[PDB]
């Protein structure tokens, strides 16, 4: 049953025994693999057993498995679920759970950092106003003048009687997308809809290519509220190129802080609908995907023309050439601005080490090959050559529907 | 909606559903518990129903399903199995099954060409010497002085209590890999074992980085015989760069004809253990994988030193720059020598067109995302953004164990 896992550069072999701890089904069956889809489409005893498993994971982590603290905490959980149909985590438990959700995230290549996570307990939040304050602290902390620090802030869990705490934005920092008369988009095409929502709720919009969006924050069962981030909290990096003087004239820039804000955090069967987290960028996210994706800023052609490349044929490799300069520009500019960035070689090399650490520690690591391999120069990185097993462990981050 | 996998393109936002996967009669490696999609390698009762399915497929494809000739062919197939334990394909059935196997191959991006395949029937072949003649005709035909033509030569099928026809080499044309006195390898490190098997069977070896290997050909129940390809038959392309003048001095080269020779061709339960097939190259196969893989020629550093890059640090993207030029050199040299090649941009754009063709014709196309997406410039190609469903259809090419 246990899958044999080979690295093809090195000829080495491991066996994933960790996958036996999965309690949640992915999208594949023996008839067909759907491993490449991005998104595929409680009652007391089910919660109670997810809770026990997690409490068990927690006492294992602190080497107190079977002790008196462990025993009585299980009793406390059974007592609370039996009476109320739910329960609550202690702060240390939450801290362990948040790190473990990151650790378990098959699509994250930055997991060597997993144990280094500042966890802000925001479960004593009763308003969108308070959410904003908490969010501003997270950003201030996480940014740290360019010396970025991984952080998560956790707002109040879901409850059966009421609506969720939610952040409408998919990240804490995002650029606006304005549909134009002419049918094109100024700004980021990925954010057209959230830009339109911000306007609908009273935002006076800019008209630039990089207008930081405001936040729509939603307390249970209320209209979302609009909050503009103080601009001094939002660190941005102007993009120049080491050798190409003209590159700066493109006026391209990106924000320092990658911070997901619409994923659900699940710990011990409890669900945290608003729990934004941030780390630091790997350069290809910006250099390749955000700037060069055809459904994003789509700047490749512009850059190739600047580079006076032959755009008439594909075989001149003008796309590859321009894409490299752009990734180079992102790395250079971040390093110049003294803002933390990792390149895809450094990142994937450290992910290989993480795979080795996890093998010894846990007997495996869930990993999504298509997400782990970078979007340029795939086979030039060691992860390309590494077979990977993908499965869902809890604690987990999940996707959740947009609240509108 | 529909109870078949929903399949999304993220560049375009368009949706399809795959209904072809319903036809799959063979389980892959994945289960709901865990996806294994990134793994490289993972009596008469059974034969007769496979045969029936194939005959049904043939008859549907010529629009004569349910007809008297369809039923008589079914009856003829049953009788032949009933008395001999096996059966035999009519000529046009083999032609159809061979193309269908190419059409069904999830790992091939060149499938838009599937309808154009020269099928050479070599089911009369009765010795190792004749296999050689057949193979020489294939190479001459397929090479066509650089205007390459897809072809497959089919030798006799596995028999009950009778040895297989086998080609021992993994491709018709491959370079030697000589294990050096100091652990390192001269030539292609992927070919150490086969090289050593050639020497063991009486080949006098060269001392070069690019020595074309001899063929080890095995008739049923006989030891393999060694055959040297006449060099006038093996078209090679010396590698040079359009602007970097020193690149020619590296003395790199590659062969024109990519020809898989150790795969099993399965058709209606019949097994063709010797059925070598060939197409033409996608440039990344040579420029990226064969030349730059750490476990192949590993020339990235050498080229980056020539290009005067900073190889002491990852963030100079020296690997990415050198890789781009090596690929460009491959494209340019093949073009100069008038030998067919396709770049990873054109290949993938044409594979997208193939997915549309197949949606309309069969209701889907089995595709292995990890293999379809090229090893450089991944997200710059349209296939990165296209979700794919992977499943096994028959007729098929299979991996098979090495005969020794
Ligand atoms: C510390 C530096 C970090 C780096 C360099 C990093 C890198 C990455 C990259 C490149 C991806 C793929 C992103 C994409 O292509 O959309 C990713 C995904 C992800 N990361 Fe990390 N990450 C870091 C920190 C974190 C932290 C702190 C967390 C949570 C505590 C986290 C959780 C996730 C999750 C849940 C995904 C999947 C996102 C999705 O499926 O939409 N990462 N990361
Ligand atoms: C016409 C030009 C063709 C092109 C451009 C092409 C392209 C490719 C590429 C890039 C791969 C992946 C190779 C690798 O990374 O190892 C591949 C795999 C494959 N191709 Fe095609 N191909 C062509 C013709 C053919 C033909 C004629 C056949 C057989 C009838 C074929 C059958 C296959 C099969 C079975 C694989 C899987 C190989 C494996 O798993 O080892 N292709 N093709
Ligand atoms: C925490 C962290 C570190 C890092 N280096 N980089 C990141 C980028 C995030 C993750 N992944 C993209 C970025 O976030 C973008 C917003 N995510 C929305 C969810 C989503 C998902 C799929 C398809 C969709 F249409 C929408 C996060
Ligand atoms: C027909 C055709 C067209 C084309 N453009 N390109 C090709 C390259 C073939 C396919 N794929 C690599 C090349 O052939 C190499 C032979 N591979 C043996 C099987 C194998 C599998 C995994 C790991 C291994 F070590 C060995 C064929
Ligand atoms: C269809 C395909 O799964 C999709 O384009 C994925 C591929 N791999 C990825 N890998 C990362 N890191 N991020 C992505 O957005 C994607 N997109
Ligand atoms: C581990 C991974 O499956 C392996 O390195 C695969 C990835 N994709 C590939 N894709 C192609 N076309 N050829 C290959 O050899 C590989 N190698
Ligand atoms: Zn799968």
Coordinates of C-alpha atoms in Angstrom, one line a residue, chain B residues 178-186:
Chain B
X178 CA 31.5 5.1 -20.8
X179 CA 32.2 4.8 -17.0
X180 CA 35.6 6.4 -16.4
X181 CA 38.5 5.3 -14.2
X182 CA 37.4 8.1 -11.7
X183 CA 33.7 7.4 -11.3
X184 CA 32.6 10.1 -13.8
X185 CA 31.0 9.3 -17.2
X186 CA 32.1 10.2 -20.7

